[PDB]
Design an enzyme around this catalytic site. Sequence first.
Site, PDB file in Angstrom:
ATOM      1  N   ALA A   1      30.503  37.803  42.386  1.00 51.99           N
ATOM      2  CA  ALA A   1      29.348  37.230  41.701  1.00 51.99           C
ATOM      3  C   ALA A   1      29.804  35.907  41.040  1.00 51.99           C
ATOM      4  O   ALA A   1      29.420  34.835  41.525  1.00 51.99           O
ATOM      5  CB  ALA A   1      28.788  38.209  40.678  1.00 51.99           C
TER       6      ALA A   1
ATOM      7  N   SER B   1      30.523  39.398  37.442  1.00 47.51           N
ATOM      8  CA  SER B   1      29.537  40.470  37.540  1.00 47.51           C
ATOM      9  C   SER B   1      29.827  41.468  36.405  1.00 47.51           C
ATOM     10  O   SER B   1      30.646  41.185  35.533  1.00 47.51           O
ATOM     11  CB  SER B   1      29.695  41.173  38.885  1.00 47.51           C
TER      12      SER B   1
ATOM     13  N   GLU C   1      30.033  25.823  18.761  1.00 46.58           N
ATOM     14  CA  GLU C   1      28.691  25.720  18.200  1.00 46.58           C
ATOM     15  C   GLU C   1      27.834  26.950  18.475  1.00 46.58           C
ATOM     16  O   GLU C   1      27.114  27.365  17.572  1.00 46.58           O
ATOM     17  CB  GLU C   1      27.982  24.432  18.622  1.00 46.58           C
TER      18      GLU C   1
END
EC number: 3.6.5.-
Lengths: 430, 428, 123, 429, 430
Positions: free
Chosen positions: D11, D132, D246
């Site tokens: 993935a 994944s 952030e």
Amino acid sequence: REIVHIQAGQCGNQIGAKFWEVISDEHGIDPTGSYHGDSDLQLERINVYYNEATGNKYVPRAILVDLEPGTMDSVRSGPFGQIFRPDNFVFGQSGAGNNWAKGHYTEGAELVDSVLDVVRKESESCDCLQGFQLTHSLGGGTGSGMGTLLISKIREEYPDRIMNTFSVMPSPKVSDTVVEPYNATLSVHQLVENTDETYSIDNEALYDICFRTLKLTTPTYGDLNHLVSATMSGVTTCLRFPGQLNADLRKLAVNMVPFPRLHFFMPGFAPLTSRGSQQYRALTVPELTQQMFDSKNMMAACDPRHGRYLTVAAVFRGRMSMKEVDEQMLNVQNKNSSYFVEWIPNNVKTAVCDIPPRGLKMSATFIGNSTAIQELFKRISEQFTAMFRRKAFLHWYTGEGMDEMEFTEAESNMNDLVSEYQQYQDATAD
Amino acid sequence: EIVHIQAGQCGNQIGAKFWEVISDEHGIDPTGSYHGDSDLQLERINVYYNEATGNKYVPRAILVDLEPGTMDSVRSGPFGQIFRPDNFVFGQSGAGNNWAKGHYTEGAELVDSVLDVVRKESESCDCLQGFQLTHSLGGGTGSGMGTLLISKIREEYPDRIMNTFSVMPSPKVSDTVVEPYNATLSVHQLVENTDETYSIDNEALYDICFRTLKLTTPTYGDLNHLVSATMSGVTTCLRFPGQLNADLRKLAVNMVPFPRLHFFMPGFAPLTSRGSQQYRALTVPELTQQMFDSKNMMAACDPRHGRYLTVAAVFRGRMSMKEVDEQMLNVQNKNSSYFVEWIPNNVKTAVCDIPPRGLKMSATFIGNSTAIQELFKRISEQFTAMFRRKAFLHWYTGEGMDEMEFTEAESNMNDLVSEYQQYQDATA
Amino acid sequence: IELNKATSGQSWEVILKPPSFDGVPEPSLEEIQKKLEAAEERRKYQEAELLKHLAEKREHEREVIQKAIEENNNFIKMAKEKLAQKMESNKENREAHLAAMLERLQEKDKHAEEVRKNKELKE
Amino acid sequence: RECISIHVGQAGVQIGNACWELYCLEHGIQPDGQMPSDDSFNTFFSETGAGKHVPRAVFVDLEPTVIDEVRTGTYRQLFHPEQLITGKEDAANNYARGHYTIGKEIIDLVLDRIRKLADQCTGLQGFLVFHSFGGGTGSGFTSLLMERLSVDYGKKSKLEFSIYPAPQVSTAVVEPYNSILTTHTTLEHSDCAFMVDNEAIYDICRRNLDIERPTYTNLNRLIGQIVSSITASLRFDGALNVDLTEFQTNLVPYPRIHFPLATYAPVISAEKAYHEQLSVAEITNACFEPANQMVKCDPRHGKYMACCLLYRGDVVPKDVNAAIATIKTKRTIQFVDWCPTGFKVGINYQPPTVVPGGDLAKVQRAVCMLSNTTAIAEAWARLDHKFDLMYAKRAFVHWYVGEGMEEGEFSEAREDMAALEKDYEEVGV
Amino acid sequence: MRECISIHVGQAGVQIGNACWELYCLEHGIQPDGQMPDDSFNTFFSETGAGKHVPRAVFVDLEPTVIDEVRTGTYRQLFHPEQLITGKEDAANNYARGHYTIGKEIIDLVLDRIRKLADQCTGLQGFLVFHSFGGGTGSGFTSLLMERLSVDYGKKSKLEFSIYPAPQVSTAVVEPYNSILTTHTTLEHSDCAFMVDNEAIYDICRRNLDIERPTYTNLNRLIGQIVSSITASLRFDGALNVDLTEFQTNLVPYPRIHFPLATYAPVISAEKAYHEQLSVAEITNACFEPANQMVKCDPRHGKYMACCLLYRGDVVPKDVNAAIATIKTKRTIQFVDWCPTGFKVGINYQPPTVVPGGDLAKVQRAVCMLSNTTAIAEAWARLDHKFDLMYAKRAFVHWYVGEGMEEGEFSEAREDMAALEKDYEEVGVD
Ligand SMILES: CC[C@H](C)[C@@H]([C@@H](CC(=O)N1CCC[C@H]1[C@H](OC)[C@@H](C)C(=O)N[C@@H](Cc1ccccc1)C(=O)O)OC)N(C)C(=O)[C@@H](NC(=O)C(C)(C)NC)C(C)C
Ligand SMILES: Nc1nc2c(ncn2[C@@H]2O[C@H](COP(=O)(O)OP(=O)(O)OP(=O)(O)O)[C@@H](O)[C@H]2O)c(=O)[nH]1
Ligand SMILES: Nc1nc2c(ncn2[C@@H]2O[C@H](COP(=O)(O)OP(=O)(O)OP(=O)(O)O)[C@@H](O)[C@H]2O)c(=O)[nH]1
Ligand SMILES: COc1cc2c(c(OC)c1OC)-c1ccc(OC)c(=O)cc1[C@@H](NC(C)=O)CC2
Ligand SMILES: Nc1nc2c(ncn2[C@@H]2O[C@H](COP(=O)(O)OP(=O)(O)O)[C@@H](O)[C@H]2O)c(=O)[nH]1
Ligand SMILES: Nc1nc2c(ncn2[C@@H]2O[C@H](COP(=O)(O)OP(=O)(O)O)[C@@H](O)[C@H]2O)c(=O)[nH]1
Ligand SMILES: [Mg+2]
Ligand SMILES: [Mg+2]
């Protein structure tokens, strides 16, 4: 394979010579020994009883033995006579004077080793010795004494081989020699221990046949020997002729002899013919079957219906139907079921030979092991006892160095044999 | 990369049929040359066939038998030319339908000889997946030697996976009395040594042929035809590039919930007859229920008797994936008693746009059902009949065996039925 | 309200209601490899136990192939030995049979000599 | 300022293929590495003596198939032979195999390409790990890597890109084991994880794009848009989320509850007729409807703790607050006590870039939302139950124990997953 | 490969071997010189550098006659003179001679030739022993040879073809003794034995070939068809089936229970006319008629342990299965509860071939049904009773004992038979 023959005494050589006349003719051999017959079967098993000689001649494997030159001369001057090897004629001049002890012990023994040399010579000539066959009188001296002596002396040397005899039982109907039951009894003992099989030729039956049946008022020995010979070719058919066996003495013995002491056979023949008489009409297979199993056709004066058959071997000769034969044979035992021991299953064997005898389109020979033979032994014991009780003629025996014990022992051993025959006669399978 | 071993009369015939069906589906003619249409075939060819340059494609197949009979059938057969001559490993003393012969005495004399060939064939693999055994459980070679090969391999390649095509004996097909003795001895070995076992049942292969294919006199050809079909169907995800894109180990990890419970119920839709006749397409719901119905299971068990621990299903050709998904979810909704709740999303679908040979739409089932214990109870009973009376044991004790080895194999297999039992009765 | 202003970007806070609460609250490589090693020991040992049972099976295979070999040789020994005793007891048996029957005859051969002896005494 | 995009498993690799495909578009890079005629793009690309700008990416997969597909595609030139690491055999849907077995094997070598990627750094901001959830490769190894990354490059940020498993999608029966096992290990080590429920993406490609059966390619077209809409301000000269540290602040108040809910607009198709292109008020209203949510959960029944509104293209700040003012008028949208009821809006003026000749369509205006909600635990409960059914009956466990693991860890994973479930209870008051 | 050596002991064994080997030549287009104009027949005939196809056979006999008929016969060239072994003196219908006395003198010369035929075997399947139950050679020599081969070749497969004695087909008084002693001695050394009741072969030749008084040739020819039909699965290799050794696994449940019953069909007279032909269903049902049984027994009254059908000619599975079905309904085919009820089937391509100038007609299709029934135990009991009758009074026993045997060797042999009888009772228990 081959058989060695010994004829002993007067009777011995007498019946022997005739056996050789019968079977030589049956094999297409002339008195010189030259084969001049048609069929190749007459030769197929010729070696059983003959030696292949030089000039393609055949010579009987037979030893002629006696303590008087007499009968051996009769034989020599006789028809085939020149057929036998003259070296085999082992003769003495002494005589046995119808005395067992002169035969067995005294006079007999002196010639015995000379005889054995000749039997050892005929045994060496052999490719495979089958056994031996003796033709002898049981009432004389040479036949009864020297006969039984030879049996024993041979037995020492050939314990492996079959000792088979043609023992001719004495009847007072035929001979006056009072001491015959003594000689009979002593010989029976030797048989009961030294022979694999014995065919019981009884002069009582022989006489009664020639008289009551063949209607010869004064039957000669030639008339009686004719029956002996007819029987002998018969009892030795499968031995000489090729058929559906195989063809051995041991094989016969193992099947015909269930208990060792009991190897005394009741021969019988059908049809009964007069010496050298042309046969008119032949008998049917039932006639042959019925006759053969009848007391009147037995070579031993015992009634088979008075005892029980342990084993039966019947030999049919001539070209006939085996289905008729097999039908007839099975009828006899299915109706006479009581005279055949149930404890010896399938005790009636049948051999058929396509080759019939001279002047007979069909013959039938019977060999039975009926307990009824006790009748003959009993007859002899009674005859012996009568005289023994009175110690009659005994110094003819004690004079040869014998013992009254040897005599009592012999009676006793005979008596035991009868009791043994009776035991299995009375024995039931339940 | 997978190494293919075929053992015995059954195994070599079954194996020869897989190798010819897949040869057609990959465009490899009986000589070993690519003549196929799409390059989609050669994409995953490296799993079964090797190169020679050539280009020549040789199947990664090792042929084993204790007598030459069957080997020569293959040799003289059509696709039989494609095999490496140096890969035919055979004896002359047939083991003669005796597990103890094939597994000990006779087999042992040819095992090391076979192993050398696998050793060679595994070295020429970048990375190997595992092994593929095709064999009968009732004979001697496949039954005994085939189990011996599995044991020996497990010792040499522990990490590599054990996949088998194990055909189950039935009194319907084949009259040898001893078959139950062999299979029970074979099963005992498979319980402990394989990872995935495709339980092909001759009872069922015959009944399908008879009652359903309307074959009055079913032959091995017809019986094996269904098997070849199913083997291509269960190896669709391996030898073909689609969204899946998976392997042997992944299959086992997902199909096998518990170790011993690794015996699968193969299936198929539609049930095609040899040659005759094809014609008319099937709808997706017609395909689904067929495949999920007992009248299609290559194993003699009624799935409505147990509970499916895990299900696998490969659909073939051009179909609506929507239609497929739609029917599967409907099936799991309707027959929810026969699927385990405690293993979520336990029914797995697969699709492949290339349709199989002749028929333009297929479905291939693989169930790890507790129902399988019915195939074992059957085998155990047939075994016990003869065994209680110690019948035909002489043939085994003659080969060095003990009565204990039989007493255990049955015990171990009865324990397997009591094991399948536990999860048939289990909920959440 | 403002946060920041930039070239190809900008930012600004936007408060809609204040927070009801003014307070807010209400790793080693030596030990990862110690635990990584730990899992490897286990995997390697169960494989070593798998190896033990697999080699124990090899022993069984060696045992049965040997039983079959020994069963055939004990069978051949028994057969050969029973026959040895059979063929001997036979030779032994038959020999005494003949040796006794010759003695019985030699005993009768003794008798004959004494009869010839008893006749001499009588003269 | 530098940023390493690590791609673990099938993935994370295919996903990493889609993103660097989109970055090369957005920055004007060729598949050969070179670019023609604002320097902030270099936070992800290292230039060579040949002027070619090579991505700061390391592709890891335990089977050659997937990475070999990279060394094939036009972007074969873009990367070095060292940065595309491929093992022999994959973990085979097994977490324990990917971590302890095939993990240990490849770990050191994997860290080297990272080291040497970082030996070329002024100062690494952090790492962006793509993977994944239920893959043996995209779970076992990711978690192993995160352990060593937290040691070897401690204090540097970690931004997880996780793909949450779905039945509608190619899922495997063992995934709930791998999912919890991985979360247990990758919990302490991640700083901010952006879940991607495959189910949510599936519907989005259906209802909007009109693809009934969407391919992985089509599903990754949107994952690159959203992931690029996340990384937008790092690759360009922007003001909101100018650094990795952030997000840890802007979205992660409580450290364990580091799973923000993503949202994107507009979901648009090209094979449909032209019309009046969407306004700010159109796409801001849409941003709140669970129809365009990246993860499937009820936001309406979940107490919020943060919010961001990352826009793109042709936007005006007045029109932005004109939509905020209109939504608070109708909907309430709850928040936790310890948190202030409000957003953190930022506009990256750069235009929405879509793949030339792709499923998606060219749009002038585009938005993405980052929203940490207690509602995200509605998907952890899904996973925790599926785990609890199988583990109750010990279904499949033997495979994990076969790789060297322990039942000891299976419980440790669930106990922590129950403690994390209680953290969403302690907060959602 | 898969080589098989045939040994023929005694008169019965040899004569059958001739019927067998004659048919075999015809079966394989082979000419009597050894040459011939499927390589599966090589299992029975070895081949030479000259191209001659010599049988893997040993012909033994304690007397020369029977074997000499082959050494002069039409197939004098078909065999090696070395492989036709003969003694001079036979076993006189006595096991103890065949076994000990006479066999001791040939055994090593016999075994030495088997060793030379064993060498020409790339991979020997085993031995086929043809012998009589009642001959001295057939009984004694066979048991000595079997014992001896079980040392020489250990557990190597030993099969038998034993001719069960019948009154009608010759037989002798001592045959039960011979048959019981031989069963006992061979019982261990045998892996499988096919009994051949001479009465049954007599009955079939009578009732079907319409022969009023059948010859040995007639019987042996009928026997050879059955024997060849059993061995067809070894001289031929057909796809169809053909598979002995497999039958043998189903046929033998326990080691002592190794006596299948053959039920050959169809037996048709070579002068039947319109005849042509019979369906598979005719010939299959025929197997269940006691009139076709190789041994006279009652398996309608006995439980079954196996059933094998050996088709040959023009047979197709359809009708075979269709036939098997018709039978499998009927309740007289009662199997036990410990073994299955399936019928193991085998099918050949090569139809039954007929003998030049034969007694039998040429059939398109023939079957032989081998089965394991508790009815075969009757043949034992039948024989055992006959033995029991004579042994009770120890009739003939002395001829055995005289050859070195003990009375115990008869007790042991009988006790073993009673065990074999008890064992067949025990096995039919459900
Ligand atoms: C119930 C199972 C049996 C054993 C079969 C089958 C055997 C078979 O298929 N056989 C026996 C050799 C091979 C094969 C058959 O007949 C030449 C060909 C066409 C085939 O299918 N060959 C395969 C290749 C092959 C060769 C050898 C082995 C397997 C497969 C092919 O060409 O594709 O016969 C039709 N059968 C129904 C039967 O009718 C047999 N009956 C039985 O076994 C019964 C009595 C029903 N058992 C309880 C018997 C009378 C032949
Ligand atoms: N969206 C998306 N999900 C993917 C992709 N590939 C696989 N998946 C998902 O990832 C999960 C399985 O993990 P994988 O990454 O495919 O497998 P892996 O173990 O990491 O790697 P391999 O061993 O090479 O298969 C499932 O939920 C799949 O739906 C992809 O390209 N895109
Ligand atoms: N069917 C049949 N039975 C025979 C044949 N030859 C003999 N017999 C039987 O075999 C038994 C006698 O055994 P034999 O084989 O003749 O004797 P042998 O001792 O083995 O051999 P020899 O020493 O030559 O007599 C009797 O039951 C006869 O029915 C034959 O060719 N066919
Ligand atoms: C090599 O071929 C296959 C390999 C596998 C599977 C499978 O069935 C679809 C195959 O086709 C037969 C597979 C099987 C079962 C599963 O659960 C029952 C699962 O979750 C998952 C799977 C497979 N994964 C997926 C997403 O289908 C992985 C292993
Ligand atoms: N049948 C028959 N009996 C004879 C013959 N010669 C003598 N006998 C009988 O034999 C017995 C006497 O034996 P014999 O031969 O004279 O004595 P040996 O010469 O000393 O042996 C008497 O019972 C006579 O009946 C003969 O040629 N034929
Ligand atoms: N389906 C199928 N079963 C077979 C085949 N050949 C034999 N069998 C079965 O295999 C079992 C016996 O194994 P077999 O192959 O003969 O023995 P092996 O050579 O010793 O492995 C029985 O159940 C037979 O029915 C075949 O080609 N296909
Ligand atoms: Mg994986
Ligand atoms: Mg004999």
